[PDB]
Amino acid sequence: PLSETKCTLKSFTVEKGIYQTSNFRVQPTESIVRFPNITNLCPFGEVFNATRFASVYAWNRKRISNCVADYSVLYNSASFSTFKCYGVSPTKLNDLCFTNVYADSFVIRGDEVRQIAPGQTGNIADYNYKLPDDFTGCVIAWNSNNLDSKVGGNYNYLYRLFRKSNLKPFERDISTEIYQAGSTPCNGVKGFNCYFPLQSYGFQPTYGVGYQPYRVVVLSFELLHAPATVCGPKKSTNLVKNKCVNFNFNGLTGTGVLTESNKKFLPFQQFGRDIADTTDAVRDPQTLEILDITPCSFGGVSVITPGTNTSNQVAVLYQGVNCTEVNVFQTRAGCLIGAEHVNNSYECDIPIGAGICASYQT
Amino acid sequence: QCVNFTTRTQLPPAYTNSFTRGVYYPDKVFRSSVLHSTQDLFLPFFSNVTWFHAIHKRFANPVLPFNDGVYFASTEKSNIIRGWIFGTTLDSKTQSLLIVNNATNVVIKVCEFQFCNDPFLGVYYHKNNKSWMESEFRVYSSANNCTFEYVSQPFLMDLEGKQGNFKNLREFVFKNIDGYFKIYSKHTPINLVRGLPQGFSALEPLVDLPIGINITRFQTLHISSGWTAGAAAYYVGYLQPRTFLLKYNENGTITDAVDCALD
Amino acid sequence: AISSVLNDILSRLDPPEAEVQIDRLITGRLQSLQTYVTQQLIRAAEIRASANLAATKMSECVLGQSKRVDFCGKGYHLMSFPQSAPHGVVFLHVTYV
Amino acid sequence: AISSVLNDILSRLDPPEAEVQIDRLITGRLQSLQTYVTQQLIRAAEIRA
Amino acid sequence: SMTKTSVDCTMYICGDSTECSNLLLQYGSFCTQLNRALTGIAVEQDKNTQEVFAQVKQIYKTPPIKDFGGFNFSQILPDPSKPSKRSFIEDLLFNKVTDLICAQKFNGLTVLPPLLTDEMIAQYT
């Protein structure tokens, strides 16, 4: 600590006084995360063996929630033509928990691959199906040109190129009739500078990649403020209070000491926040419990040492904290080590604060 | 079902004033001794709501647009309203949403409903084994092609007829977020003669419905042509992108609310 | 940026993708921190002028007897009584009117 | 930015790409120079007092 | 004087993450000087009380037998029976001048204690 001031002052001679060098912080020893039992596993691989998928606007969904996700059967490694992923791979979804999962399957074109993205616009994105901002998974695609393609185009599947307005996330339109395309309603039957909204795939196996079918499977994800029902492959790492830990509660990741308080909560309000819009108090999603968020102790380091030509004795001072680890004395300023407490009063030499002064004497 | 109400006639568009209503929890996040501001679809303070009532010669079962958002405020002694009807065509041509409370739980289904002339619900000759349980369903003739079903937690409902000033108060707010239907529910006793009493109350979330159907119109269900109605009063409001200041107590309940652009 | 919490950003976007998002959050906070420091340096000069004026009034009004008009207060100055106050000092001025 | 030396930026990245790295330095240097002038004006008010 | 405050940009950019620390090294000393500027402010706050509150190095007291010539100074004089020495006027001055501070400390805002406490200031007065 004597040399810590030398590098702080950028000099080999340390004058008498108090100087700030580093900042101490208590690192979390364990990780306390608590969520209830797993319900079921999502059909990630069961939808890959389907003979034929739905269209872009017709997407079929199988509802299996509690995003533990089947990690067993995975066809996503080097088995298909093109891999475009966002967020994290589905192999990493075992560490995350989502509320509901909707498995969708649809076939798009070559130019429609770039339009697939959460919270983005496009022809099929706005007018047919839009990915929610809660989707961290991968967009899986494969080239079906050797199957679904027909000579002169395949009109079996359909798609909607135009709509009177953009679709919100999680919205579907199954109507095949003639409705308003642009901003000027033409009142039913096509004409008056409107266009027939429904369209058919023109897939020709002999043309370029933009004109060829691509089977895409996307599992819709939902992340909200509702309590999560699943934690990891392992759950609790059983709680031991009054310790610095890294906690994830109801989707709020943070590091702090977990203590019990008297705060009364409403049944429909899961977690609170302070005036700083930061995690304050949370509830147990698994069982009935009330925990308070107390961040781990931290502060600045103060070095009290005399001149270089006087003595090499160094007294380390911790500002506004109690030292449980550790000539260990405690004052109103905080934990002070390397110094002796004298009941007698002397002229103030090295400033400490809170009615304390330090000096080098016998 | 087929034959409508005999003494029913056309109701005039009567209006009244709603003072502090429209306040609700914008999210599920708890709050302790902290003030916040938010902007969402709200009911402005000191606004105008349409006067609706059912008296033995005006029976209210209108059709109003859901486009701009809808507010529900029901002041009734017998809690005569059993639910509401949602949908666009409101017929078997498409799917329509229905919310009916059986006095135990709330049954929510999305099906293909066959719509008759005058829908309604309730029971007859309660004096023998009341139980207030739904028996005769006069709303639709049949249903099929059901893509959604939900059952809520058990509720307590007292439908018994009373005399004097209004007592029970149920205020609901039904909105559509990205296809999700977020339902608010609150029940508190009040004392009301006519109009609305002066006070303040906070609305709490009930259930979120992941349906995703568009609703352009709605209806109200009361309480087959010889049946009468008790003393019923309720409202249909319209939500707007107002900005409120939401104050929270130590327990997370909102005792104070202020509308910015009103004053 | 996308969000104000790095725990959500770093756990989703790729290192090359999250680098742009975190760069905007850090630059905005560095400018927000300089704004507070600049405002504190301005108040540090204002509180210094009040402190230098305090040492002047403490010496002339309390310790000695000042003949300055409208300095120790209205009237002919006699003496002054200092009083302790939170983050300041209160002067009780005795004058002849 | 990539590097503080502008001669390495102009000799490697394209003219459209070099302007992005140079802009990061200019906005950083002008802010550093603005911080210096801000400190000088504060010290100038102290020496005048 | 004002309330002594200390801010650290190490925890202000973000805590317990190497992503913030690595990019602050590219920014260098930008907020390092800001840490020294706020540190110098806390030093000026303590020096404002030294040049004002303490005029002399000697302490004086009131006599046990008090003849004031007809004036009553018991109002401005502190109460020796109290654990903290305060006069009748200083009681109002302290009580009429007004957790918010504890919640701000969680984001890395450090409030430094003053060099002199309430007991100290009254003894120089």
From Swiss-Prot, chain A:
Changing residue 202 to S: In strain: Omicron/BA.1. Residues 154-162 are annotated as: Immunodominant HLA epitope recognized by the CD8+. Residues 25-247 are annotated as: Receptor-binding domain (RBD). Changing residue 158 to R: Increased resistance to neutralizing antibodies. Decreases HLA binding to NF9 epitope. Increased binding affinity to human ACE2. Changing residue 192 to P: In strain: Omicron/XBB.1.5, Omicron/EG.5.1. Residues 143-214 are annotated as: Receptor-binding motif. It comes from the Viruses. Changing residue 52 to T: In strain: Omicron/BQ.1.1, Omicron/XBB.1.5, Omicron/EG.5.1. Changing residue 114 to S: In strain: Omicron/BA.2, Omicron/BA.2.12.1, Omicron/BA.2.75, Omicron/BA.4, Omicron/BA.5, Omicron/BQ.1.1, Omicron/XBB.1.5, Omicron/EG.5.1. Residues 25-41, 161-196, 225-247 are annotated as: Disordered. Changing residue 339 to V: In strain: 19B/501Y. Glycans are attached at residues 29, 31, 37, 49, 309, 322, 343, 362. Residues 40-233 form the BetaCoV S1-CTD domain. Changing residue 52 to K: In strain: Mu/B.1.621. Residues 109-111 are annotated as: Integrin-binding motif. Changing residue 49 to Q: Reduced viral infectivity. Changing residue 189 to A: Increased resistance to neutralizing antibodies. Changing residue 77 to F: In strain: Omicron/BA.2, Omicron/BA.2.12.1, Omicron/BA.2.75, Omicron/BA.4, Omicron/BA.5, Omicron/BQ.1.1, Omicron/XBB.1.5, Omicron/EG.5.1. Changing residue 146 to K: In strain: Omicron/BA.1, Omicron/BA.2, Omicron/BA.2.12.1, Omicron/BA.2.75, Omicron/BA.4, Omicron/BA.5, Omicron/BQ.1.1, Omicron/XBB.1.5, Omicron/EG.5.1. Disulfide bonds join 42-67, 85-138, 97-231, 186-194, 244-296, 323-335, 348-357. Attaches the virion to the cell membrane by interacting with host receptor, initiating the infection. The major receptor is host ACE2. When S2/S2' has been cleaved, binding to the receptor triggers direct fusion at the cell membrane. When S2/S2' has not been cleaved, binding to the receptor results in internalization of the virus by endocytosis using host TFRC and GRM2 and leading to fusion of the virion membrane with the host endosomal membrane. Alternatively, may use NRP1/NRP2 and integrin as entry receptors. This is Spike protein S1. The gene is S.
UniProtKB/Swiss-Prot annotation, chain B:
Changing residue 132 to R: In strain: Omicron/BA.2.75. Attaches the virion to the cell membrane by interacting with host receptor, initiating the infection. The major receptor is host ACE2. When S2/S2' has been cleaved, binding to the receptor triggers direct fusion at the cell membrane. When S2/S2' has not been cleaved, binding to the receptor results in internalization of the virus by endocytosis using host TFRC and GRM2 and leading to fusion of the virion membrane with the host endosomal membrane. Alternatively, may use NRP1/NRP2 and integrin as entry receptors. Binds to host ACE2. RBD also interacts with the N-linked glycan on 'Asn-90' of ACE2. Cleavage of S generates a polybasic C-terminal sequence on S1 that binds to host Neuropilin-1 (NRP1) and Neuropilin-2 (NRP2) receptors. Interacts with host integrin alpha-5/beta-1 (ITGA5:ITGB1) and with ACE2 in complex with integrin alpha-5/beta-1 (ITGA5:ITGB1). May interact via cytoplasmic c-terminus with M protein. May interact (via N-terminus) with host bilirubin and biliverdin, thereby preventing antibody binding to the SARS-CoV-2 spike NTD via an allosteric mechanism. Changing residue 63 to A: In strain: Omicron/XBB.1.5, Omicron/EG.5.1. Glycans are attached at residues 4, 48, 102, 129, 145, 214, 251. Residues 1-263 form the BetaCoV S1-NTD domain. Residues 249-263 are annotated as: Putative superantigen. It comes from Severe acute respiratory syndrome coronavirus 2 (2019-nCoV). Changing residue 7 to N: In strain: Gamma/P.1. The chain holds residues 14 to 294 of 1273 of the full protein. Changing residue 6 to R: In strain: Delta/B.1.617.2, Omicron/BA.2, Omicron/BA.2.12.1, Omicron/BA.2.75, Omicron/BA.4, Omicron/BA.5. This is Spike protein S1. Changing residue 101 to Q: Partial loss of biliverdin affinity. Residues 122-144, 153-165 are annotated as: Disordered. Changing residue 118 to Y: In strain: Gamma/P.1. Changing residue 122 to D: In strain: Kappa/B.1.617.1, Omicron/BA.2, Omicron/BA.2.12.1, Omicron/BA.2.75, Omicron/BA.4, Omicron/BA.5, Omicron/BQ.1.1, Omicron/XBB.1.5, Omicron/EG.5.1. Disulfide bonds join 2-116, 111-146.
Swiss-Prot record, chain D:
It comes from the Viruses. Subunit of the fusion protein that is processed upon entry into the host cell. Mediates fusion of the virion and cellular membranes by functioning as a class I viral fusion protein. Contains a viral fusion peptide that is unmasked after S2 cleavage. This cleavage can occur at the cell membrane by host TMPRSS2 or during endocytosis by host CSTL. In either case, this triggers an extensive and irreversible conformational change that leads to fusion of the viral envelope with the cellular cytoplasmic membrane, releasing viral genomic RNA into the host cell cytoplasm. This is Spike protein S2'. It comes from Severe acute respiratory syndrome coronavirus 2. The lineage of its organism: Viruses, Riboviria, Orthornavirae, Pisuviricota, Pisoniviricetes. The gene is S.
